[PDB]
Amino acid sequence: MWIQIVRFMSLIIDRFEMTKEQEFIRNLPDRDLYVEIDQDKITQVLDNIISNALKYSPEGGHVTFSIDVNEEEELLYISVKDEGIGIPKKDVEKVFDRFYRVDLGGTGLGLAIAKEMVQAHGGDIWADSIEGKGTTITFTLPYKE
Ligand SMILES: Nc1ncnc2c1ncn2[C@@H]1O[C@H](COP(=O)(O)OP(=O)(O)OP(=O)(O)O)[C@@H](O)[C@H]1O
Ligand SMILES: [Mg+2]
Ligand SMILES: [Mg+2]
Questions:
Q1: Which of 25, 28, 94, 110 could disulfide-pair with 48, CB 3.0 to 4.6 Å?
Q2: Which superkingdom is the protein from?
Q3: Distance from residue 48's CA to the centre of ligand 1 (Å)
Q4: Is the CB of 69 within 6 Å of ligand 1?
Q5: How far, in Å, from the CA of 123 to the mean position of ligand 3?
Q6: Which CATH class is domain 1-145?
């Protein structure tokens, strides 16, 4: 089954934008884009990435969501950017590994789950980060329309 990913994400962000206190910025197209992934799996992917962005963010920092369309590859690129503590250069591609944490204390599965779910549905995921400036997590999903 297919879901309209723009609507879907807006509602996810809305439930985060409306609870407690933190800013949320959007680069989301007025386009009818569909992905074939169960609601609950894509929810876990996004919840896990958003949870990290907020957990590791300071001040009234911005979390920015983007969806960009690669028509040639038939892929959407979905990204979550924060202005948080960032990730050490040597660790940036360890962060998706099961139980891996940058520093007894914590689980370290959020991003492993996100990777497994994205990959199972034909996408890929990566982290771009500068220690002390912030992190972008980006994943792809096949789409139609
Ligand atoms: N947005 C981010 N900014 C800075 N560091 C991050 C960010 N996202 C993840 N990390 C680092 O990557 C590690 C792995 O993240 P992941 O979500 O898998 O585990 P966790 O948040 O530590 O635990 P869990 O999500 O299972 O409760 C984190 O422990 C943290 O060091
Ligand atoms: Mg986490
Ligand atoms: Mg693959």
A1: 110
A2: Bacteria
A3: 9
A4: no
A5: 6
A6: alpha beta
